[PDB]
Amino acid sequence: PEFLNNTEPLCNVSGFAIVSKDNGIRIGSRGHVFVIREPFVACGPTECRTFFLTQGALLNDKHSNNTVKDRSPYRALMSVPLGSSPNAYQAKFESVAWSATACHDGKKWLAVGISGADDDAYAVIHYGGMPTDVVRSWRKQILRTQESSCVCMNGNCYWVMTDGPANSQASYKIFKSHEGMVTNEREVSFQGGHIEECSCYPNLGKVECVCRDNWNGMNRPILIFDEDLDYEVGYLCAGIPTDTPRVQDSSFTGSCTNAVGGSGTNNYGVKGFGFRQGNSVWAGRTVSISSRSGFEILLIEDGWIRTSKTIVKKVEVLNNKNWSGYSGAFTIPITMTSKQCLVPCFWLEMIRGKPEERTSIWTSSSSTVFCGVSSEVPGWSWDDGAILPFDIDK
Amino acid sequence: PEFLNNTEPLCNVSGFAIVSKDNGIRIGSRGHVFVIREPFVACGPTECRTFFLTQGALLNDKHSNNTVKDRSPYRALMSVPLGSSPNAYQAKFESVAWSATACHDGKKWLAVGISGADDDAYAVIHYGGMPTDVVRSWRKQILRTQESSCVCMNGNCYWVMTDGPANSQASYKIFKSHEGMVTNEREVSFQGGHIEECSCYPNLGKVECVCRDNWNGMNRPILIFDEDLDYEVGYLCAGIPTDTPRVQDSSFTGSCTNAVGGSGTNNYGVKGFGFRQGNSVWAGRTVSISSRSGFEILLIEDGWIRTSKTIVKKVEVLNNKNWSGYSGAFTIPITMTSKQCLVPCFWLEMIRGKPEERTSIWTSSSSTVFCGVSSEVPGWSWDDGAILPFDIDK
Amino acid sequence: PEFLNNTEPLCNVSGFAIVSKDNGIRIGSRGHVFVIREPFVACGPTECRTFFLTQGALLNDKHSNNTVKDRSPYRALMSVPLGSSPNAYQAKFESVAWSATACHDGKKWLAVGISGADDDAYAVIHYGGMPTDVVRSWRKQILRTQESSCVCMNGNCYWVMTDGPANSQASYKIFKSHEGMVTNEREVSFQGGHIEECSCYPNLGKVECVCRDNWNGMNRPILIFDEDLDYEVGYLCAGIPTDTPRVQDSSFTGSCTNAVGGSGTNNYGVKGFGFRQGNSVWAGRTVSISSRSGFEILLIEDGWIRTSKTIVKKVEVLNNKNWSGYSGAFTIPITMTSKQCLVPCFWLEMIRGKPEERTSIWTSSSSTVFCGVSSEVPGWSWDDGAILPFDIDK
Amino acid sequence: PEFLNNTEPLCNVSGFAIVSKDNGIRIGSRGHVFVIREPFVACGPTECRTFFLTQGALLNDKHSNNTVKDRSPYRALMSVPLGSSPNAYQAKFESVAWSATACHDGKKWLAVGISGADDDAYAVIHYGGMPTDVVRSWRKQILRTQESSCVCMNGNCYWVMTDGPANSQASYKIFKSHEGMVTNEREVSFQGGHIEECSCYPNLGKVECVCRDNWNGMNRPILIFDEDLDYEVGYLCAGIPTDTPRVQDSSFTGSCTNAVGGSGTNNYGVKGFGFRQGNSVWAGRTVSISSRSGFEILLIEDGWIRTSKTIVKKVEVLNNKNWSGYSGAFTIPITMTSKQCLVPCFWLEMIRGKPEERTSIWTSSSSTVFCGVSSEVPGWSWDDGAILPFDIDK
Ligand SMILES: CC(=O)N[C@H]1[C@H]([C@H](O)[C@H](O)CO)O[C@@](OC[C@H]2O[C@@H](O)[C@H](O)[C@@H](O)[C@H]2O)(C(=O)O)C[C@@H]1O
Ligand SMILES: CC(=O)N[C@H]1[C@H]([C@H](O)[C@H](O)CO)O[C@@](OC[C@H]2O[C@@H](O)[C@H](O)[C@@H](O)[C@H]2O)(C(=O)O)C[C@@H]1O
Ligand SMILES: CC(=O)N[C@H]1[C@H]([C@H](O)[C@H](O)CO)O[C@@](OC[C@H]2O[C@@H](O)[C@H](O)[C@@H](O)[C@H]2O)(C(=O)O)C[C@@H]1O
Ligand SMILES: CC(=O)N[C@H]1[C@H]([C@H](O)[C@H](O)CO)O[C@@](OC[C@H]2O[C@@H](O)[C@H](O)[C@@H](O)[C@H]2O)(C(=O)O)C[C@@H]1O
Ligand SMILES: CC(=O)N[C@H]1[C@H]([C@H](O)[C@H](O)CO)O[C@@](O)(C(=O)O)C[C@@H]1O
Ligand SMILES: CC(=O)N[C@H]1[C@H]([C@H](O)[C@H](O)CO)O[C@@](O)(C(=O)O)C[C@@H]1O
Ligand SMILES: CC(=O)N[C@H]1[C@H]([C@H](O)[C@H](O)CO)O[C@@](O)(C(=O)O)C[C@@H]1O
Ligand SMILES: CC(=O)N[C@H]1[C@H]([C@H](O)[C@H](O)CO)O[C@@](O)(C(=O)O)C[C@@H]1O
Ligand SMILES: *[C@@H]1O[C@H](CO)[C@@H](O)[C@H](O)[C@H]1NC(C)=O
Ligand SMILES: *[C@@H]1O[C@H](CO)[C@@H](O)[C@H](O)[C@H]1NC(C)=O
Ligand SMILES: *[C@@H]1O[C@H](CO)[C@@H](O)[C@H](O)[C@H]1NC(C)=O
Ligand SMILES: *[C@@H]1O[C@H](CO)[C@@H](O)[C@H](O)[C@H]1NC(C)=O
Ligand SMILES: *[C@@H]1O[C@H](CO)[C@@H](O)[C@H](O)[C@H]1NC(C)=O
Ligand SMILES: *[C@@H]1O[C@H](CO)[C@@H](O)[C@H](O)[C@H]1NC(C)=O
Ligand SMILES: *[C@@H]1O[C@H](CO)[C@@H](O)[C@H](O)[C@H]1NC(C)=O
Ligand SMILES: *[C@@H]1O[C@H](CO)[C@@H](O)[C@H](O)[C@H]1NC(C)=O
Ligand SMILES: [Ca+2]
Ligand SMILES: [Ca+2]
Ligand SMILES: [Ca+2]
Ligand SMILES: [Ca+2]
């Protein structure tokens, strides 16, 4: 076993094909399936796995009550093979966690899970299933991380964490690890900016991240760094906003440097992703501008380098009549594709229950997963498909 | 690990012995078992697996409602070890799919799954669990494939797809792939003929397929091709019809070149199989001439090359008092048998629920599997065995 | 991987220690566990597994109705790791079967499963999970086999089958196989004798079997054969009867050559076992002389060679207040113990439900497993422990 | 595969980070999860596993009735991957047992399980899943062992057993084994002392144990021995009592040689642990002095060598509003951490049901697991989290 290089360029793709759908909530109507949220996908040398944060409870059980809540001592990071439901008997325990990231360095799985009190949380780093290191909260205000795959290159793994207020200036740090031990860290200077839940991927030896601004920006922060943790930080240049909530495209003017907000879009957001394509960008977003409803992906011409409004392609993978949620990025390594470039993929979370469906006592989500291909691919609507309310709701 | 040659001659067999029965519907009365249809079997170098198309729902759950429907965003191709029920906790996810084929090239599993809208569907090709290629609908009319094992030889895997009307002239293509990438394709010219759901197997370096004509033929199309995708196409010569619906044998006259229909048999059919045995043929068929009821296999003397009505052997594996369904072919490679020829096997789908059992809200199936042996083997009736209606039906 | 020699002498043991208890019926009150009977244990180079014949149905489900019946198209031979319940999600499918035997030759698992109609049944031989050969009924009267482990030596595996009447002269054959192919067979001449459900084990290069006489004998037949299938056949000499039903010891006179019966013991029996210990024998038997109740093991001095009534040791592993059933023998190979002799072990089936517990609609069993050790070991009573009736019974 | 040395010094740690939480009782409200108690953790070269003693029954089933009872024929030692619930479908059977210990020598798992009658119990030793040896009760009074991991060094595995009265002078023995065979034993002379349920770990080639005195001591016995089973025995010197029940710290005076009791603390106790840290000690204890409620860990300066009352650090991992239970020690070997010292970890059992929660008919527990790290780590309260009563209680 050797470390994955992961220093190849990201593939240029013209479409995204569906790779997986777990149907977890449909199955959990009768089967034994965890209540979850914040699913994400990460790939090792031989397989991809779906990670998720459980609520330490099963669907259609009384312990699923009040699972709209984000943090508790019962949440854990677990994983299943890609496409499996997050069920009670296949789930592999990874970390105690109400916020997490995970990735594979070519030799072993790395998992970073945060638990503890809001004012004194800490991350536990697991490597090959063994606890190796700890990262303590440095601002004592809900230490939190990506909720998606971290990035490994040449035996080093990288991820981004945040600590501080949800709706004002916070603190943002990049971490570097080797075999589960933190070997470097760097605080990112981003005055007036806000970074949470970064979706990161490798591209030609650098880590490129598209994040969530939960403060004054309806545009997404972009963070790019190298092995030294030297970084560039700013916003996705595109004159098309991709956070939620946001305003209509015609009411928006892009910026590469500043958070663009107002119009009732401040103080919230949703985890999302984007992939640089030379000077252009593939960016995902909810179809609704106000709620987590529907999902589409847009190819914006020169959207990575200028405030372009030119949409070259648009593909819908979930219609606006269905609930979406978080979305995130990962890549498929060369050891699985035998290609000369890294394949960009994304996953989509579809949230059911509270708060949008008030007649249910619980909140969970299921997922779909898509990977980039060299040709155009039609869209459709692959919705969660569960029929609510459930038995436990009655 | 090396590629399977699979260029040996097909074994001549004198009987078929039962190898597996999953009892999935019986088990799913209480256990957690997927609602499925279109099961099939494929074998790798070390094991055989049962593949199936789920309805993204479990038996005896409310989401099993209306599962007589053929296509939805919730259907997925999954697999279990041969003989296991298609249950929620052993199932391995293979592809999002409402139509599929799969096979093993000696190194990795290949899975081809079709999803999307009827007028813009696409196949995603998975190799070793990774998405590798895509095949788009070329006629924009329900792109569809075998619902049985594809065929791999010398590292190349082959399968047949159809696109176009269900009850008139459609378009038929053969595909060739290597390591999950399509490397060749060929459209089959078959005017007045109709090809769907091919059951294919290797025989002396060629792929031989016995298919379903859903148009004007109660006889089965035969398609034979080589590595160049050079092909011969026609109908099973035997003066014994093996599709359903069909007419009584005495009312039928065979043809090697033309679809023989009429008498209320047009515009429907069922997936079935046959194995060439020199100039003769082993062919399966339902016992009923009008419905998917019962199952028998016939050895027809010279039935591959002329309109023979001579039945040398007949074996019943399901009596006419029980529901059958699709049936398909696969082979066991030399790496498992240490033989000098490929062993022909078939599986039988037994459908329960709609439309034949109207008091149930759901439709699923279970399977039995049989393999050819060098001596005669008695038949019996290995029925599904489930007692309907189920709890959810009441 | 190499073939197991298995030609070492059987160990002399002074006691039996409990190794496993599956608690399957207790667990199946809520868990998803197969209705079974005829469990047995067989060991490979790296692990022991519990085999069992399912009824193709789960405990506490409606399909468990009428499972007192012995043969149906829904019964299958499956296996789980030693000590696991025979549950729906760990069970490995081995063969379609209402009678079976299985063993490991050092390289692969061999499974022999009989199915089909009573008057035309056939055994399918599975090797490494692949169907390899078939053995047809030669008397057309319920072809049947050991319901316990077969014996493998130097790459050859051996087992005993019976065909013919249950309560009069039948036909008995020994089979030899290599890599799943039958390579030799021998009919055993045993006029006035009856052989069923042999419990066999290797001892110094010979196969020694202790069987069930379902005709005129309350003493157990003994069958001993070598690689040529040259055999000796007779009865366990001991002046202590070990079948059930039987008479009190004081009313019994042993015989090495003749079936000893009468006194209302004719025409029934139970599968049981014994281990030669030089000239002595360890023999199991129910505590009750009339029903399958309780279980004890006796060491009878010189009981293998003469009509001795001398009991050197007696150990009870199930008191007479609890239901027992079949029992059988297996051995642990040298590759697991690193010893110079083969370790004798037995399993005990504990039957619950019909016919002894009439208020239940079903019949199943659980098991305990014991292995011989060089010192004396106390007994106890490890009963099934399930509380009947179950929910489905009400 | 080679034997683990395990002769390195124990790491000096400044804090304990949470590694795992199984949420088994919460999950078992709907999922199929064993009723258990006495969980513990042991680590092999490649993974850690959670062991537990089942009651041969599942949560929320009628067979969970009266599971406050400690010994029955239905209890078994089983294991799951660290962090998994003790569920019916992942559980690996290890031994029949109502008292147990287990550990990994670098090549195979060793499990020691005690069953049988109170007055004639015996331990069965399992090695690599095979029964290898037996240890009989020598005082005929509930032979019993650690209920936590044993210790392996250089291919030899060590554990402590007790036989005799629960509330007066008993007999205590140390055992040494190689490949599952007992190779040495030593009776420990400890007049006026009482030893049960030792928590042991390797430290610089010696085994150090912190145990439970169920007689006259509210301080914990300490037992230290080498490969020859030469031992030192006494009590934890610290002037801080760590058993339960106990008195307030201010009312306690420590002793290195004598049991310190009285004040209503006699004749009971709870399994607990401690780790030597040079001359100091990390010791766990319930927060309540009278019941198994809450849990904290204390670093006591020079507490291993003198009657110190100096508490350098205190960390709470379960508040006093929640039920705790047993706790135990294990270490992580060098093969997983690549360190030069052994990492100390502990697990905590959280008991729900009888006798503290009288409205439930059952008793079970779940667990949390913590490992030592080189820096201080905040505490929190990771409680069991189940909402009682359960369905079966009503
Ligand atoms: C899944 C779904 O129903 N999506 C709806 C969405 C949600 O119902 C809503 O966003 C939840 O708050 O509603 C949307 O319609 C937008 C529209 O709704 C009118 O009622 C309102 O007057 C308008 O101001 C505007 O919000 C949406 O697009 O988000 C439609 C979507 O289909
Ligand atoms: C499983 C089963 O019941 N099979 C039946 C079959 C089905 O009931 C039927 O095909 C569903 O449409 O019925 C069959 O009988 C054939 C016979 O039925 C008469 O009622 C009718 O008048 C005739 O024209 C003819 O269809 C059949 O063979 O298919 C019998 C079979 O047992
Ligand atoms: C598990 C159990 O209850 N075993 C009983 C056994 C069974 O009840 C019985 O064999 C089922 O048919 O009963 C036994 O008692 C033997 C005794 O019973 C008397 O009622 C009868 O009059 C006598 O002839 C004789 O059968 C038995 O030993 O088999 C007792 C056992 O505990
Ligand atoms: C989980 C929990 O409720 N823990 C309680 C504990 C238990 O209720 C109790 O120990 C069970 O017997 O109670 C404790 O309070 C201690 C206190 O209780 C008074 O009622 C009593 O008068 C005092 O003598 C004393 O026992 C405890 O600390 O153990 C509190 C704890 O929160
Ligand atoms: C650690 C944590 O609580 N994460 C939560 C975050 C934060 O609340 C926001 O990022 C503001 O910081 O977002 C969610 O609430 C959300 O938007 O659905 C869910 C997620 O669990
Ligand atoms: C892709 C698809 O819909 N396949 C379906 C086909 C087509 O309807 C026919 O082949 C006509 O094209 O056959 C079925 O309906 C059938 O006969 O039971 C089931 C199957 O799922
Ligand atoms: C193949 C078969 O039916 N085997 C059955 C046999 C035969 O009936 C007898 O051996 C007489 O031949 O014994 C049982 O009935 C029994 O005693 O419990 C169970 C077993 O399933
Ligand atoms: C073998 C056995 O019965 N062990 C039991 C012990 C003994 O009763 C005591 O150590 C006294 O010997 O402790 C418990 O009762 C307890 O305190 O919860 C549980 C445990 O199962
Ligand atoms: C969920 O919580 C609410 C608030 O306590 C309660 O009223 C309701 O009964 C709970 N639902 C269930 C099924 O536990
Ligand atoms: C992607 O496209 C850009 C812009 O044309 C090009 O510079 C780059 O080389 C491409 N990358 C790959 C991997 O082909
Ligand atoms: C199935 O669907 C029909 C039609 O909508 C509906 O009447 C029926 O209640 C459904 N059955 C169940 C159990 O959901
Ligand atoms: C099968 O039988 C045909 C016709 O006799 C013969 O030509 C062919 O060689 C046989 N094939 C095999 C594999 O034996
Ligand atoms: C079992 O079978 C009998 C006889 O047909 C029937 O009366 C009874 O209802 C069945 N029990 C169940 C629960 O199916
Ligand atoms: C078992 O005991 C018999 C009788 O003493 C003896 O002949 C034989 O050698 C022994 N076998 C073994 C394996 O020790
Ligand atoms: C538990 O045992 C008690 C005492 O026998 C009994 O009263 C109660 O019904 C039992 N509970 C259940 C659900 O079996
Ligand atoms: C732990 O600390 C003690 C006391 O300072 C010291 O003697 C010992 O060397 C340390 N052990 C390790 C493994 O560092
Ligand atoms: Ca925002
Ligand atoms: Ca037709
Ligand atoms: Ca008899
Ligand atoms: Ca005490």
mmCIF file of N, CA and C in Angstrom, chain D residues 103-157:
data_model
loop_
_atom_site.group_PDB
_atom_site.id
_atom_site.type_symbol
_atom_site.label_atom_id
_atom_site.label_comp_id
_atom_site.label_asym_id
_atom_site.label_seq_id
_atom_site.Cartn_x
_atom_site.Cartn_y
_atom_site.Cartn_z
ATOM 1 N N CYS D 103 -8.490 -11.070 24.792
ATOM 2 C CA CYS D 103 -7.376 -10.241 24.339
ATOM 3 C C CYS D 103 -6.747 -10.849 23.088
ATOM 4 N N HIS D 104 -5.843 -10.108 22.455
ATOM 5 C CA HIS D 104 -5.234 -10.551 21.205
ATOM 6 C C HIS D 104 -3.721 -10.605 21.382
ATOM 7 N N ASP D 105 -3.112 -11.733 21.022
ATOM 8 C CA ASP D 105 -1.680 -11.914 21.252
ATOM 9 C C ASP D 105 -0.818 -11.462 20.076
ATOM 10 N N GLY D 106 -1.462 -10.931 19.041
ATOM 11 C CA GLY D 106 -0.761 -10.503 17.845
ATOM 12 C C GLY D 106 -1.039 -11.423 16.672
ATOM 13 N N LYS D 107 -1.339 -12.682 16.975
ATOM 14 C CA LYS D 107 -1.665 -13.657 15.942
ATOM 15 C C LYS D 107 -3.152 -14.006 15.925
ATOM 16 N N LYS D 108 -3.720 -14.270 17.099
ATOM 17 C CA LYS D 108 -5.125 -14.664 17.196
ATOM 18 C C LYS D 108 -5.816 -14.068 18.418
ATOM 19 N N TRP D 109 -7.145 -14.090 18.400
ATOM 20 C CA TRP D 109 -7.944 -13.696 19.555
ATOM 21 C C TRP D 109 -7.988 -14.808 20.589
ATOM 22 N N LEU D 110 -7.821 -14.434 21.851
ATOM 23 C CA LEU D 110 -8.005 -15.351 22.964
ATOM 24 C C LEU D 110 -9.261 -14.940 23.717
ATOM 25 N N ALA D 111 -10.149 -15.893 23.970
ATOM 26 C CA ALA D 111 -11.334 -15.615 24.768
ATOM 27 C C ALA D 111 -11.485 -16.656 25.867
ATOM 28 N N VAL D 112 -11.759 -16.188 27.079
ATOM 29 C CA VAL D 112 -11.951 -17.068 28.223
ATOM 30 C C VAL D 112 -13.350 -16.837 28.770
ATOM 31 N N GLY D 113 -14.194 -17.862 28.699
ATOM 32 C CA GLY D 113 -15.574 -17.728 29.129
ATOM 33 C C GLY D 113 -15.964 -18.762 30.163
ATOM 34 N N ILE D 114 -16.583 -18.302 31.244
ATOM 35 C CA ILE D 114 -16.991 -19.187 32.331
ATOM 36 C C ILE D 114 -18.488 -19.450 32.291
ATOM 37 N N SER D 115 -18.867 -20.720 32.372
ATOM 38 C CA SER D 115 -20.275 -21.084 32.469
ATOM 39 C C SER D 115 -20.416 -22.283 33.405
ATOM 40 N N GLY D 116 -21.624 -22.823 33.504
ATOM 41 C CA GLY D 116 -21.886 -23.918 34.420
ATOM 42 C C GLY D 116 -22.579 -23.470 35.695
ATOM 43 N N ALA D 117 -22.804 -24.417 36.600
ATOM 44 C CA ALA D 117 -23.465 -24.135 37.869
ATOM 45 C C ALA D 117 -22.557 -23.339 38.804
ATOM 46 N N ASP D 118 -23.160 -22.597 39.727
ATOM 47 C CA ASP D 118 -22.395 -21.805 40.684
ATOM 48 C C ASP D 118 -21.375 -22.640 41.452
ATOM 49 N N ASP D 119 -21.731 -23.883 41.765
ATOM 50 C CA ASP D 119 -20.869 -24.718 42.599
ATOM 51 C C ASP D 119 -19.957 -25.651 41.801
ATOM 52 N N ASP D 120 -19.961 -25.515 40.480
ATOM 53 C CA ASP D 120 -19.091 -26.336 39.646
ATOM 54 C C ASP D 120 -18.901 -25.707 38.274
ATOM 55 N N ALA D 121 -18.550 -24.428 38.263
ATOM 56 C CA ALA D 121 -18.369 -23.706 37.013
ATOM 57 C C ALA D 121 -17.018 -24.044 36.396
ATOM 58 N N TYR D 122 -16.854 -23.727 35.119
ATOM 59 C CA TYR D 122 -15.554 -23.888 34.485
ATOM 60 C C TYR D 122 -15.340 -22.903 33.348
ATOM 61 N N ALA D 123 -14.089 -22.494 33.176
ATOM 62 C CA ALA D 123 -13.714 -21.616 32.084
ATOM 63 C C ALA D 123 -13.327 -22.445 30.870
ATOM 64 N N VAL D 124 -13.838 -22.049 29.711
ATOM 65 C CA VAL D 124 -13.379 -22.613 28.454
ATOM 66 C C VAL D 124 -12.521 -21.576 27.752
ATOM 67 N N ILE D 125 -11.329 -21.988 27.346
ATOM 68 C CA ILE D 125 -10.419 -21.088 26.662
ATOM 69 C C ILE D 125 -10.525 -21.307 25.160
ATOM 70 N N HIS D 126 -10.811 -20.230 24.434
ATOM 71 C CA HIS D 126 -10.935 -20.275 22.983
ATOM 72 C C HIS D 126 -9.759 -19.528 22.383
ATOM 73 N N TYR D 127 -9.110 -20.125 21.391
ATOM 74 C CA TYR D 127 -7.992 -19.470 20.731
ATOM 75 C C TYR D 127 -8.184 -19.548 19.225
ATOM 76 N N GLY D 128 -8.264 -18.389 18.579
ATOM 77 C CA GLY D 128 -8.531 -18.337 17.154
ATOM 78 C C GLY D 128 -9.869 -18.968 16.815
ATOM 79 N N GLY D 129 -10.781 -18.960 17.781
ATOM 80 C CA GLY D 129 -12.119 -19.483 17.570
ATOM 81 C C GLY D 129 -12.259 -20.960 17.890
ATOM 82 N N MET D 130 -11.157 -21.593 18.279
ATOM 83 C CA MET D 130 -11.174 -23.013 18.616
ATOM 84 C C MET D 130 -10.994 -23.225 20.115
ATOM 85 N N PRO D 131 -11.726 -24.193 20.685
ATOM 86 C CA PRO D 131 -11.574 -24.504 22.110
ATOM 87 C C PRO D 131 -10.243 -25.206 22.349
ATOM 88 N N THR D 132 -9.457 -24.706 23.297
ATOM 89 C CA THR D 132 -8.099 -25.208 23.487
ATOM 90 C C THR D 132 -7.837 -25.791 24.874
ATOM 91 N N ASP D 133 -8.449 -25.210 25.900
ATOM 92 C CA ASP D 133 -8.185 -25.638 27.272
ATOM 93 C C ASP D 133 -9.366 -25.323 28.185
ATOM 94 N N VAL D 134 -9.312 -25.849 29.403
ATOM 95 C CA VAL D 134 -10.368 -25.645 30.384
ATOM 96 C C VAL D 134 -9.743 -25.364 31.743
ATOM 97 N N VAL D 135 -10.357 -24.464 32.503
ATOM 98 C CA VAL D 135 -9.958 -24.229 33.885
ATOM 99 C C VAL D 135 -11.156 -24.444 34.800
ATOM 100 N N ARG D 136 -11.055 -25.426 35.689
ATOM 101 C CA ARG D 136 -12.165 -25.744 36.582
ATOM 102 C C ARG D 136 -12.157 -24.904 37.853
ATOM 103 N N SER D 137 -13.341 -24.708 38.420
ATOM 104 C CA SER D 137 -13.486 -24.059 39.715
ATOM 105 C C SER D 137 -12.712 -24.859 40.759
ATOM 106 N N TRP D 138 -11.903 -24.175 41.561
ATOM 107 C CA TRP D 138 -11.098 -24.855 42.575
ATOM 108 C C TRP D 138 -11.640 -24.656 43.993
ATOM 109 N N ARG D 139 -12.604 -23.749 44.137
ATOM 110 C CA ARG D 139 -13.261 -23.512 45.423
ATOM 111 C C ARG D 139 -14.764 -23.767 45.339
ATOM 112 N N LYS D 140 -15.242 -24.074 44.136
ATOM 113 C CA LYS D 140 -16.646 -24.415 43.923
ATOM 114 C C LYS D 140 -17.601 -23.321 44.400
ATOM 115 N N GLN D 141 -17.218 -22.066 44.189
ATOM 116 C CA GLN D 141 -18.048 -20.934 44.594
ATOM 117 C C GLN D 141 -17.988 -19.794 43.576
ATOM 118 N N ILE D 142 -18.707 -19.960 42.472
ATOM 119 C CA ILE D 142 -18.777 -18.952 41.419
ATOM 120 C C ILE D 142 -17.402 -18.509 40.917
ATOM 121 N N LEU D 143 -16.711 -19.416 40.236
ATOM 122 C CA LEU D 143 -15.492 -19.065 39.522
ATOM 123 C C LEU D 143 -15.806 -17.850 38.652
ATOM 124 N N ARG D 144 -14.949 -16.833 38.690
ATOM 125 C CA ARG D 144 -15.233 -15.590 37.975
ATOM 126 C C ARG D 144 -13.960 -14.853 37.574
ATOM 127 N N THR D 145 -14.053 -14.010 36.547
ATOM 128 C CA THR D 145 -12.859 -13.346 36.031
ATOM 129 C C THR D 145 -13.035 -11.834 35.808
ATOM 130 N N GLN D 146 -12.245 -11.260 34.906
ATOM 131 C CA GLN D 146 -12.061 -9.807 34.869
ATOM 132 C C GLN D 146 -13.234 -8.964 34.351
ATOM 133 N N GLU D 147 -13.980 -9.484 33.381
ATOM 134 C CA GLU D 147 -14.950 -8.676 32.644
ATOM 135 C C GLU D 147 -14.255 -7.497 31.961
ATOM 136 N N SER D 148 -12.991 -7.687 31.601
ATOM 137 C CA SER D 148 -12.272 -6.715 30.784
ATOM 138 C C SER D 148 -11.135 -7.421 30.060
ATOM 139 N N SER D 149 -10.373 -6.666 29.277
ATOM 140 C CA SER D 149 -9.319 -7.250 28.458
ATOM 141 C C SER D 149 -8.225 -7.902 29.297
ATOM 142 N N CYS D 150 -7.746 -9.059 28.852
ATOM 143 C CA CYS D 150 -6.565 -9.660 29.462
ATOM 144 C C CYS D 150 -5.347 -8.986 28.840
ATOM 145 N N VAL D 151 -4.154 -9.421 29.224
ATOM 146 C CA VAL D 151 -2.935 -8.782 28.749
ATOM 147 C C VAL D 151 -2.029 -9.805 28.084
ATOM 148 N N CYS D 152 -1.571 -9.498 26.875
ATOM 149 C CA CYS D 152 -0.660 -10.383 26.159
ATOM 150 C C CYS D 152 0.703 -9.727 25.985
ATOM 151 N N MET D 153 1.761 -10.480 26.268
ATOM 152 C CA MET D 153 3.126 -10.008 26.049
ATOM 153 C C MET D 153 4.001 -11.131 25.509
ATOM 154 N N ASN D 154 4.686 -10.861 24.401
ATOM 155 C CA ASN D 154 5.607 -11.828 23.807
ATOM 156 C C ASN D 154 4.986 -13.201 23.571
ATOM 157 N N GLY D 155 3.697 -13.227 23.251
ATOM 158 C CA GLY D 155 3.029 -14.473 22.912
ATOM 159 C C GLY D 155 2.390 -15.186 24.089
ATOM 160 N N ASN D 156 2.528 -14.606 25.277
ATOM 161 C CA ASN D 156 1.882 -15.133 26.474
ATOM 162 C C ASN D 156 0.751 -14.209 26.901
ATOM 163 N N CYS D 157 -0.377 -14.785 27.296
ATOM 164 C CA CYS D 157 -1.508 -13.980 27.740
ATOM 165 C C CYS D 157 -1.829 -14.274 29.199
#
